[PDB]
Design a protein around this ligand. Structure first.
Ligand code: MG
Ligand code: MG
Ligand code: ZN
Ligand code: ZN
Lengths: 1362, 49
RNA sequence: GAGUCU
């Protein structure tokens, strides 16, 4: 059975007969009365084998007494019935028939090889026109179609001088005659004279084919089939339904059409019938053969009785319901069950409730095995009945097997690996699975009737794999983010919250207790509340410089409940951890603290003990939910009446015709959105600090103990957002479109929505629930694409010896630091020796892990940016090194060799997109954007530091910015970036560049619902290409007559003014142009589409005045749905519609000639005297102002960067940082935590291939893109041995393409495009040596990674050593 | 004087399933949907209470 | 085809 690799080739007519064990010459299946195989039928026993084991048809030879005996009477071999699914057959077609995969599957293969159009070949196949195979005199050209009339011309005139024929015979003789060696030479030699792009693309692909066609051992004859193979009977079964009806596969029906038409064709050739009749039959043969192979491809698919089309052979290989995706990359499994899950709050974190009757049926063979050993059952049949009767002795044995024998639990959907965890079973009474509450987060399992699948690890390997890797207690941190997934929620948080939180006096204030046990004594004795301020003696163990724990006793001012909670806390943590009122966010840090200080064992016990006490004290509290708990502020009707009058004001000014519809729409949303903020601020102010209590002194106040508030403040369930809808204001509801409804709901759920308010609410309800069902498939398809590219990637090496990495500046974006350097750089090998500011003593070694200890020192010395070893920068050919990846985020320590990073990386990206599509959608009703970013207020004092800014001073006396991507920093005392903002175009700065500002100062100010076009020069406005009706429109009012002009774009524009560009040209008093300072550019600002203009022609202007106002309608609430397409496009490496232009080579710019508006740039670098020219559109106003020392990758046009242009000009590290930052910004908007290394994993696979420019010393030469890994292994031998070095360029690939580019065709055909992959592999004669995981999962082998890593490399040394 | 017609009943925008939800006015549309759909799945008991 | 968990 065992083997090395699998190969695909075309089937020779000779090869098809080798597989066959007899020819099916009849369409008959079975005799209707004596149900047996028919004489040379589709289900023939003489050809495919006997129905019973070792039994001929007539029944002359039975059983193994006659071993290898072929009966003389019926003609049937006495062998196993197994031979019926294995032996194939054949049909000798009277006439050749083209294979549809080597005809329709574009590129046509048969057409690409003949250089003859597919249309032209089909005319020959359906007998419309003849084709010249070999015109003796070159009067008749080869491969020239002759019509039926044009065939009659040559017939009388020439006759034998030409051999033009028709049908598949003609195309096969045409493929026979062609010489691959002679035509290939000619294509090579005749490409030299022209040398273009599409010739060199198509002629080089033809050379690659002709060369691969020879070396593959394939012949172009085999494109056309002379022989048709038959599938074995058992694989297309005719089996009896329980009742007398039978059932058959759709292949039997397609085989019968082919045999009937082939047999009839032979008879019509015997009858020497006219060709008209013979042709019709040849057409029908082609149709039946093409329908057998791929039904729905050439024409209308042949439907059977049901009206649906008959399922073809190709169909059982292709797509989802194909063998690959459904019966091979995934399977039905023995020793599996499922049931409705329920809580098990008594259970430990390593346990799960497994029902009696489930476990009985699950562990059947292990019980029969113990029953023989204990001597209770003689045979297995005896043991079977003992278990079926459910004897008392059997329950005791079942209990014996299950101890220390884990079970796997799974939930749909399996988004990430924690969707399967291992537990030790606890047998229970009922029929329902009991799941541990803490792992509920990983499964996303709520008990409202979820079902979870059970799997028994049978083998000892599997019991150890379950216990060592997949056990719940082993899997605490998330592999996506270095943070615990096992984190208490719901009642547990609420209980520890209620315990720790303090209250005014209460029972027994200012007491003094001996220990945490006397605190439990006064609480259970009923002399103290959990909230009483008390002095308590507590002894905290803090860890020393060495491993030893140091004990420290001290009086602590904490409540009774806080003292009781310290009892759960292990020795190692400070008492400071339980001294605060604990919520969900703090409790998560408790187990993260405990994990890094103590270990795994303490955390598992601590996490449990937290769970137990948390539930218990939640129950003690009697926290509840009443209608009075939903307090509404008394001043709500006051806020609404004010806000109603404000909105009525803009609507009354709209009737006057002062404000437009779009302006009112955006302006009204801002008033209501701030009113919802006002009501909610009043609600949370009248809710949070509402408790005013009388202490033993006089009177004071504290946080309210309103039951709903506690539930949202603790973070147990709900948030302030939900409480708005309950007590405050419901808010702006979202349209199904995504845009915001202008009328928001004033009322809340306590007050009740009226008939219309509900009807408005439903718009947003259905759209959310709609995305939960529909849009999950776009997101889940991303998970799939990401896995297929990263699949094969595994840690292969300990240390690559590379010195490279990506420089990780801290993500300080939008005032507060969004992600510190510490978080981003934690658990990563220090690429370069990064010391302290004073470069005179190294602080951190080059090859060392970044532990939280080292990360704390980075904050002490204030390391700003750190170069860090990345996955992308690894120089490992085989996979990746342990150092480049760094820490396993799930384990908190160095990653192991053998662990499969590709799949872990794809899952971590794919999961939150997929699950969040179902999260804030079922939960979502209301819209809540606040995109009203009017002004930046700086918060700390600093010097103003702008970058990538070019501003100009206006008439008012204000620094107006005339650059798109302007950034504003906030520099402290010593000189480091604390805050960062995005200042937009046409914004008014308070203070210019370098000036000091105070804290709480408006440093910038602008209008958000408008993108102004601001001038750089003063003078008068001129109208150019601004014809009324063609390019712009006009609308006037009354008495005086103020008219506004609105620029039409290609949508609202006629064919007349299409190539006209509308622009407001600047001129002086005389009428001439005004040059922009220090440039030869006459001043001309191009207005885009839908640009509203107030100033008409002939108006005086200063510099800094707004010429036109481009509307900025973006009222869509950004959920996962609007950001995921961005993420998909980034990973798929798509250029945008308007890519920004970048400088290719460093050197001195000179502007050049022009094409009727379109610019040219003949840039002549200092070193490279040879020039580089490139065309630029008219309308793109350039950032660079010509004659300047421009370097590689300098933004010339403003706008979005193609990731191709980044990698091409600024290397790998630039494009990696572009993808990581751009993708991660989308997930950061939604609060999703994904480490950069997981994106970096997939980026590495995107940077797989590379195009070879200069010739090598192998067979790369020019144009042939090969994998990076392969060309480097050649370069290692070339640098030492010598000969021609191969110059290269790394190319970027999208996911869907990088997956199909892999050499493993089995990986490619299992992904997508199954029909195309198999044909391109068949013609190239490719051999897949089963490299990656998909390949071994298919063949049913051990994975070449994880536990099997060690085993696969052991086979690989057997292969090397002899 | 500008009013031409009026809704006949308070219940007319809702269905038969949703009419049987008490205090529907204080329920979210998302939960109200599932509630009306599960009310249909409610198996009748031994004693009709 | 009508549902259940996401
Ligand atoms: Mg739930
Ligand atoms: Mg559920
Ligand atoms: Zn026989
Ligand atoms: Zn490496």
């Amino acid at each position: 059975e065992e083997f090395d690799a699998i190969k695909i080739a075309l089937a020779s007519p000779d090869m098809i007969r080798s597989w066959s064990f007899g020819e099916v010459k009849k369409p008959e299946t079975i005799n209707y009365r004596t149900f047996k195989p028919e004489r040379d039928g589709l289900f023939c026993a003489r050809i495919f084998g006997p129905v019973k084991d070792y039994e001929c048809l007539c029944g002359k030879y039975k059983r193994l007494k006659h071993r290898g005996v072929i009966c003389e009477k019926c003609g049937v071999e006495v062998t196993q019935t197994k031979v019926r699914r294995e032996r194939m057959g054949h049909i000798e077609l009277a006439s050749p028939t083209a294979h549809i995969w080597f005809l329709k599957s574009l590129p046509s293969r048969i057409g690409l090889l003949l250089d003859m159009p597919l249309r032209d070949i089909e005319r020959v196949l359906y007998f419309e026109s003849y084709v010249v195979i070999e015109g003796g005199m070159t009067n008749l050209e080869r491969q020239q179609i002759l019509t039926e009339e044009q065939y009659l011309d040559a017939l009388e005139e020439f006759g034998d001088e030409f051999d033009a024929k028709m049908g598949a015979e003609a195309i096969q003789a045409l493929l026979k005659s062609m010489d691959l060696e002679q035509e290939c030479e000619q294509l090579r030699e005749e490409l030299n004279e022209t040398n273009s792009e599409t010739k060199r693309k198509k002629l080089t692909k033809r050379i690659k084919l002709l060369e691969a066609f020879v070396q593959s051992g394939n012949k172009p004859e085999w494109m056309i089939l002379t022989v048709l193979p038959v599938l074995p009977p058992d694989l297309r079964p005719l089996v009896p339904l329980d009742g007398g009806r039978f059932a058959t596969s759709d292949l039997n029906d397609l085989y019968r059409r082919v045999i009937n038409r082939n047999n009839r064709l032979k008879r019509l050739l015997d009858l020497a019938a006219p060709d008209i009749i013979v042709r019709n039959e040849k057409r029908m043969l082609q149709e039946a053969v093409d329908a057998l192979l791929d039904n729905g491809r050439r024409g209308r698919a042949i439907t059977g009785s049901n009206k649906r089309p008959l399922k073809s052979l190709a169909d059982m290989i292709k797509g989802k319901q194909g063998r690959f995706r459904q019966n091979l990359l995934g399977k039905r499994v023995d020793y599996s069950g499922r049931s409705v899950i329920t809580v098990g709050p008594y259970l430990r974190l390593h346990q799960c409730g497994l029902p009696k009757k489930m476990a009985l049926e699950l562990f059947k063979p292990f019980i029969y095995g113990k029953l023989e050993l204990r001597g209770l059952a003689t045979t297995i049949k005896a043991a079977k009945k003992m278990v079926e009767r459910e004897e008392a002795v059997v329950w005791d044995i079942l209990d014996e097997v299950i101890r220390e024998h884990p079970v796997l639990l799974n939930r749909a959907p399996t988004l990430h690996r924690l969707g399967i965890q291992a537990f030790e079973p606890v047998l229970i009474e009922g029929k329902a699975i009991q799941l541990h509450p803490l792992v509920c987060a990983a499964y996303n399992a709520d008990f409202d009737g979820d079902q979870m699948a059970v799997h028994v690890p049978l083998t000892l390997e599997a019991q150890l794999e379950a216990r060592a890797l997949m056990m719940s207690t082993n899997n605490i941190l998330s592999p996506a983010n270095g943070e615990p997934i096992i984190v208490p929620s719901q009642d547990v948080v609420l209980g520890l919250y209620y315990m720790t939180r303090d209250c005014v006096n209460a029972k027994g204030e200012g007491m003094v207790l001996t220990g945490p046990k006397e605190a439990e004594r006064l609480y259970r004795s009923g002399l103290a509340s959990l909230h009483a301020r008390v002095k308590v003696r507590i002894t905290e163990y803090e860890k020393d410089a060495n491993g030893e724990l140091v004990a420290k006793t001290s009086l602590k001012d904490t409540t009774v409940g806080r003292a009781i909670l310290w009892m759960i806390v292990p020795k190692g943590l400070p008492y400071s951890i339980v001294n605060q009122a604990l919520g969900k966010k703090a409790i998560s840090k408790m187990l993260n603290t405990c994990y890094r200080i103590l270990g795994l064992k303490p955390t598992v016990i601590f996490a449990d003990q937290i769970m137990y006490t948390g539930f218990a004290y939640a129950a003690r509290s009697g926290a509840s939910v009443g209608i009075d708990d939903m307090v509404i502020p008394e001043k709500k009707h006051e806020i609404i009446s004010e806000a109603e009058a404000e909105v009525a004001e803009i609507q009354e000014q709209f009737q006057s015709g002062l404000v437009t519809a779009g302006e009112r729409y955006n302006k009204v949303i801002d008033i209501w959105a701030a009113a919802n903020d006002r009501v909610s601020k009043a609600m949370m102010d009248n809710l949070q600090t509402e408790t005013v209590i009388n202490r033993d002194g006089q009177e004071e106040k504290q946080v309210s103990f309103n039951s709903i508030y506690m539930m949202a403040d603790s973070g147990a369930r709900g948030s302030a957002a939900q409480i708005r809808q309950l007590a405050g204001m419901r808010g702006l509801m979202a349209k199904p479109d995504g845009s915001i409804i202008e009328t928001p709901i004033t009322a809340n759920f306590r007050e009740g929505l009226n008939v219309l308010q509900y009807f408005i609410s439903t718009h947003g309800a259905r759209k959310g629930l709609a995305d939960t069902a529909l849009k999950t498939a776009n997101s889940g398809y991303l998970t799939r694409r990401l896995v297929d590219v990263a699949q094969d990637l595994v840690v292969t090496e300990d240390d690559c010896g590379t010195h490279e990495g990506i420089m990780m500046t801290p993500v300080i974006e939008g005032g507060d630091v969004k992600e510190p350097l510490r978080d981003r750089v934690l658990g990563r090998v220090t690429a370069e020796d990064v010391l302290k500011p004073g470069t005179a003593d190294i602080l951190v070694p080059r090859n060392t892990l970044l532990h939280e200890q080292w990360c704390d020192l980075l904050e002490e010395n204030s390391v700003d940016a750190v170069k860090v070893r990345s996955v992308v920068s690894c120089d490992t050919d085989f996979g990746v090194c342990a150092h480049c990846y760094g820490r396993d985020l799930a384990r908190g320590h160095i990653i192991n060799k053998g662990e499969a990073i590709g799949v872990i990386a794809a899952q971590s990206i794919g999961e939150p997109g997929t699950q969040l599509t179902m999260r804030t959608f079922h939960i979502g009703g209301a819209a809540s954007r606040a995109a009203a970013e009017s002004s930046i207020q700086v918060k700390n004092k600093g010097s103003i530091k702008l970058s990538n800014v070019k501003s100009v001073v206006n008439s008012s006396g204000k620094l107006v910015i005339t650059s798109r991507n302007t950034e504003l920093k906030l520099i402290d005392e010593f000189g480091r970036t604390k805050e960062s903002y995005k200042v937009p175009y046409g914004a008014v700065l308070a203070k210019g560049d370098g000036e000091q500002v105070a804290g709480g100062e408006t440093v910038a100010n602008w209008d958000p619902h408008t993108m102004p076009v601001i001038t750089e020069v003063s003078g008068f406005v001129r109208f150019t290409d601004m014809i009324d009706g063609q390019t712009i429109t006009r609308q006037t009012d009354e008495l005086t007559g103020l008219s506004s002009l609105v620029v039409l774009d290609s949508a609202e524009r006629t064919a007349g003014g299409k190539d006209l560009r509308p622009a407001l040209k600047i001129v002086d008093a005389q009428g001439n142009d005004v040059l922009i300072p220090g440039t030869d550019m006459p001043a001309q600002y191009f207005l885009p589409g839908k640009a509203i203009v107030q100033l008409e022609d002939g108006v005086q202007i200063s510099s800094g005045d707004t010429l036109a106002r481009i509307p900025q309608e973006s009222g869509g609430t950004k959920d996962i749905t609007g950001g995921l397409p961005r993420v998909a496009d980034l990973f798929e490496a798509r250029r945008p519609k308007e890519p920004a232009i970048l400088a290719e080579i460093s050197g001195i710019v000179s502007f050049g000639k022009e094409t009727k508006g379109k610019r040219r740039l003949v840039i002549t670098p200092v070193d490279g005297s040879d020039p580089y020219e490139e065309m630029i559109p008219k309308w793109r106003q350039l950032n660079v102002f010509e004659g300047e020392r421009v370097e590689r990758g300098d933004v010339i046009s403003d706008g979005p960067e193609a990731p191709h242009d980044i990698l091409r000009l600024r290397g790998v590290h630039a494009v990696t940082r572009y993808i990581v930052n751009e993708v991660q910004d989308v997930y950061r908007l939604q609060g999703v935590k994904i480490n950069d290394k997981h994106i970096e994993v997939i980026v590495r696979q995107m940077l797989r291939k590379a195009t070879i420019v200069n010739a090598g010393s192998s067979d790369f030469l020019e144009g042939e893109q090969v994998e990076y890994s392969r060309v480097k292994i050649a370069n290692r031998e070339l640098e030492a041995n010598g000969k021609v070095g191969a110059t290269y360029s790394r190319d970027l690939l999208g996911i869907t393409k990088a997956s199909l580019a892999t050499e493993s065709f089995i990986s490619a055909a299992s992904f997508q495009e199954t029909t195309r992959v198999l044909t391109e592999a068949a013609v190239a004669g490719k051999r897949d040596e089963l490299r990656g995981l998909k390949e071994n999962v298919i063949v049913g082998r051990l994975i070449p990674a994880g536990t099997g890593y060690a085993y696969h490399q052991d086979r690989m040394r057997r292969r090397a050593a002899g | 004087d500008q009013v031409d017609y009026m809704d006949v009943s308070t219940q007319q925008v809702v269905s038969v399933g949703a009419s049987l939800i008490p205090f529907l006015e204080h329920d979210d549309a998302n939960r109200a949907l599932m509630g009306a759909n599960m009310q249909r799945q409610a198996v009748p008991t031994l004693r009709a209470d």
